[PDB]
Write a protein that binds this ligand. Structure first.
Ligand SMILES: *[C@@H]1O[C@H](CO)[C@@H](O[C@@H]2O[C@H](CO)[C@@H](O)[C@H](O)[C@H]2NC(C)=O)[C@H](O)[C@H]1NC(C)=O
Ligand SMILES: *[C@@H]1O[C@H](CO)[C@@H](O)[C@H](O)[C@H]1NC(C)=O
Ligand SMILES: *[C@@H]1O[C@H](CO)[C@@H](O)[C@H](O)[C@H]1NC(C)=O
Ligand SMILES: *[C@@H]1O[C@H](CO)[C@@H](O)[C@H](O)[C@H]1NC(C)=O
Ligand SMILES: *[C@@H]1O[C@H](CO)[C@@H](O)[C@H](O)[C@H]1NC(C)=O
Ligand SMILES: *[C@@H]1O[C@H](CO)[C@@H](O)[C@H](O)[C@H]1NC(C)=O
Ligand SMILES: *[C@@H]1O[C@H](CO)[C@@H](O)[C@H](O)[C@H]1NC(C)=O
Ligand SMILES: *[C@@H]1O[C@H](CO)[C@@H](O)[C@H](O)[C@H]1NC(C)=O
Lengths: 248, 262, 108, 118
């Protein structure tokens, strides 16, 4: 979408594989605000909003909290406390046309600045002066939007770049979007420090001969002590035996 | 119309395996022998702590529910439609009909904007409760051998889904294309009897009578011969009495406001 | 500041141009070379905007082309309309400055 | 449209000027505005860049000294220079309405304000 009319996609109830985006070299800008770019997988949020737009090279610096300019103030404004990472890459060989690619537009003239994540898509001819335009362009009557002359012969500062901003929103909600989870090899007949989903402790795990119901994740004994767990991956039932100890 | 709920409405409090143990837990449950309404229509009904639903349809006429608060597109509401082999769970700003129904065609809402969540996966019993943002649904499908009754048997409802949707459910309405029952859950403590295979085979409603109360104190399903202390009687206050002295020595306000000279 | 020639001299009638070499963020000054025909003693008057483009009222002389870190502000048919001071501008480094080059006082 | 600058002239060293940049036709409140200074024999550098939303950018010429503004009621801009450095001896320019696939950057210029600042 055009930067003046950015396409907001809500990401929820899914596994956010941030390691691919971080590890790859396809992006030229990767500015993370409020999160650590190498710890992003461990941060769970209620909503993730993917703001997709194209800006010019010189304006990539403007896709940040606190920036100003024709785009930052009249097209796509970010809040000072924006949380998320801004990812952008050079798209010169994708959007530019020999005769100039003018299909990408941005808003240049507006009565006031946008609110965070405000999408103003009005096409009313902007009245800059005091004379009503009444649908006629002229003195003090300027169209509020203007197109970009994207061409393959333009310098880098005028080449198109594709920018994707992943906005991280945490609401009073379960927080359904998280990164991939770590898993390790199962160790049997030895004392290990284990963590099965949310069940943690120390003990010896052996093959179980117990039969759990299809919806039961772990077993607990008469003293509220965990004595069996279901393996989250292979649906094996494992008994937890406390590590041998005693007086000497 | 009303009927006797008997011992129906128990569900597995959590996803925990327990073997040959009596577990004491307090949660929202359908009271044993509660007074439950027998429906043969579909008005909007209030939703308090949770709702118990059961139906005895052979033609599968009743196949949906509406849950929410405003139910008029002002707030989010949950729409569930179970057709054939595909059940759709959707939370959106639905604009519902003033008398919603399904045909035998879909005329439930006229618009369903700003959708936030979607998931697809005889005697039928369900429990619907929204706790801390999770909408928990339990169900059981069993044989039925009565024509106009609620068999006096026992089954525990199993967890089906736990939708992580921040929905406030205070009223609800059923969706139909038959008879069904609606009851309400209360915060009582139950003693659940687990078998060696992790299922619930019996239960005691701890508030049903002094004998059931005794069972909870001993945490036994069998009460032995003897005398047991089970509760604590307290007379409650019936009024609120506040007393202060006679109001005397009033301030000479009359001497200022009704003064002969200002 | 882009390197602009100090001055341009000639009599009218010979085809001429005012080349202006300046990276100005590259892109031929971002096709953003604001060429202005500033009259001597009067405030600058823009001649051609969007160097390749001719703004309203631009003379038949008006022309403009930018290559790499260089530009070619051309006036065709040298006539009395050309004798003026010329100024070119572009964003400072890579900003939205509209900074100005060396300035070209074209004197006949 | 007509943009007539006022307030320029001779002011003693070190002071501040509340000059005004009148504009006709286009009420000067909501167009991307720029203000520049250009001394004799010198070039025009963007002293300030008054974004129509309100943001102001003073890239090179002005340094904490000059404030670009507009009087909303009269549709005429105001050109504040205050705490002018001995380096501020120059003239003013305050017009930005680009157009009449394009660039449209800093097209017009008004009558200008000429100031002698010793
Ligand atoms: C001044 O006098 C008036 C009436 O003469 C008082 O108004 C009366 O107040 C008494 C309470 O003390 C009421 O019982 C009467 O019914 C009121 N009557 C009227 C006509 O208002 C007024 O309260 C006096 N001032 C003060 C300070 O008590
Ligand atoms: C987990 O992934 C493995 C990969 O081989 C697959 O064998 C296993 O069935 C998956 N687990 C579940 C619960 O589907
Ligand atoms: C239901 O309530 C009515 C009066 O409110 C009572 O007479 C009736 O016995 C109740 N039903 C049961 C099963 O107790
Ligand atoms: C049930 O409804 C959903 C959407 O309302 C639809 O996609 C699905 O195909 C329907 N079921 C069948 C069996 O067609
Ligand atoms: C869409 O839903 C969000 C919350 O999920 C709410 O903030 C927003 O106002 C809704 N949009 C409309 C038009 O109601
Ligand atoms: C529930 O309703 C209260 C007011 O009725 C509101 O403040 C709260 O945010 C709502 N929460 C959800 C999850 O619906
Ligand atoms: C419990 O499960 C075992 C399967 O190992 C089965 O043989 C036994 O009959 C079951 N008992 C009950 C009461 O379901
Ligand atoms: C208050 O009034 C009652 C009569 O209503 C009187 O008997 C009592 O003595 C009074 N209290 C005092 C402190 O005089």
């Amino acid at each position: 979408a055009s930067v003046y009319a950015w396409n907001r996609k809500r990401i929820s109830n899914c596994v956010a594989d941030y390691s691919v985006l971080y590890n790859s070299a396809s992006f030229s800008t990767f500015k993370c605000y409020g999160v650590s770019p190498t710890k992003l997988n461990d941060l769970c949020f209620t909503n993730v909003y993917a703001d997709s737009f194209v800006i010019r090279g010189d304006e990539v610096r403007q896709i940040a909290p606190g920036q100003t300019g024709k785009i930052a103030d009249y097209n796509y404004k970010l809040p000072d406390d924006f949380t998320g990472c801004v990812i952008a890459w050079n798209s010169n060989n994708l959007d530019s046309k020999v005769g100039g690619n003018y299909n990408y537009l941005y808003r240049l003239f507006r009565k006031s600045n946008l609110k965070p994540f405000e999408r103003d898509i009005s096409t009313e001819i902007y009245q800059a002066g005091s004379t009503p335009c009444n649908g006629v362009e002229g003195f003090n009557c300027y169209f509020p939007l203007q197109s970009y002359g994207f061409q393959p012969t333009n310098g880098v500062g005028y080449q198109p770049y594709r920018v994707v901003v992943l906005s991280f929103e945490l609401l009073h909600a379960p927080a359904t979007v998280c990164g991939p989870k770590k898993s390790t090899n199962l160790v049997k007949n030895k004392c290990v420090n284990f963590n099965f989903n949310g069940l943690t402790g120390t003990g010896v795990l052996t093959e179980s001969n117990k039969k759990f119901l299809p919806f039961q994740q772990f077993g607990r004994d008469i003293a509220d002590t965990t004595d069996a767990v279901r393996d989250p991956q292979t649906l094996e039932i494992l008994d937890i035996t406390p590590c041998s100890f005693g007086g000497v | 119309a009303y009927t006797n709920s008997f011992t129906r409405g128990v569900y597995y409090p959590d996803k925990v395996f327990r073997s040959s143990v009596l577990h004491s837990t307090q949660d929202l449950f359908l009271p044993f022998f509660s007074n439950v309404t027998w429906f043969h229509d579909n008005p909007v009904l209030p939703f308090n702590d949770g709702v118990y639903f059961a139906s005895t349809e052979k033609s599968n006429i009743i196949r949906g529910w509406i849950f929410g608060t405003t139910l008029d597109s002002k707030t989010q509401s949950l729409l569930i439609v179970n057709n054939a082999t595909n059940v759709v769970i959707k939370v959106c700003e639905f604009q519902f009909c003033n008398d919603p129904f399904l045909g035998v065609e879909f005329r439930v809402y006229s618009s369903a904007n700003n959708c936030t969540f979607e998931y697809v996966s005889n005697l039928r019993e369900f429990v619907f409760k929204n706790i801390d943002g999770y909408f928990k649904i339990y169900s059981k499908h069993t044989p039925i051998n009565l024509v106009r009754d609620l068999p006096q048997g026992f089954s525990a409802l199993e967890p089906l889904v736990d939708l992580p949707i921040g929905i406030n459910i205070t009223r609800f309405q059923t969706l139909l294309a038959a008879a069904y029952y609606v009851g309400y859950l209360q915060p009582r403590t139950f003693l659940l009897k687990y078998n060696e295979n992790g299922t619930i085979t019996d239960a005691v409603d701890c508030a049903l009578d002094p004998l059931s109360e005794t069972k909870c104190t001993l945490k036994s399903f069998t009460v032995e011969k003897g005398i047991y202390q089970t509760s604590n009687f307290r007379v409650q206050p019936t009024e609120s009495i506040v007393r202060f002295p006679n109001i005397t020595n009033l301030c000479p306000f009359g001497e200022v406001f009704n003064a002969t000279r200002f | 500041v882009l390197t602009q020639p100090p001055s341009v001299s000639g009599a009218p009638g010979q085809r001429v141009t005012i080349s202006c070499t300046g990276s100005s963020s590259n892109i031929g000054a971002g096709y953003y070379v604001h060429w202005y025909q500033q009259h001597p003693g009067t405030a600058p008057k823009l001649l051609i905007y969007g160097n390749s483009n001719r703004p309203s009222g631009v003379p038949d002389r008006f022309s403009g082309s930018k290559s790499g870190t260089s530009a070619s502000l051309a006036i065709t048919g040298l006539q009395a309309e050309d004798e003026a001071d010329y100024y070119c501008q572009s964003y400072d480094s890579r900003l939205s400055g509209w900074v100005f080059g060396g300035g070209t006082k074209l004197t006949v | 449209v007509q943009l007539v600058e006022s307030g320029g002239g001779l002011v003693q060293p070190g002071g501040s000027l509340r000059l005004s940049c009148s504009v006709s036709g286009f009420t000067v409140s909501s167009n991307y505005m720029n203000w520049v200074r250009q001394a004799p024999g010198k070039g025009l550098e963007w002293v300030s860049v008054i974004y129509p939303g309100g943001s102001t950018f003073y890239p090179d010429s002005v340094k904490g000294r000059f404030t670009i503004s507009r009087d909303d009621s009269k549709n005429t801009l105001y050109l504040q220079m205050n705490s002018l450095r001995p380096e501020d001896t120059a003239a003013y320019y305050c017009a930005s309405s680009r157009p009449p696939l394009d660039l449209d950057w800093f097209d017009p210029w008004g009558q200008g304000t000429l100031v002698i600042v010793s």
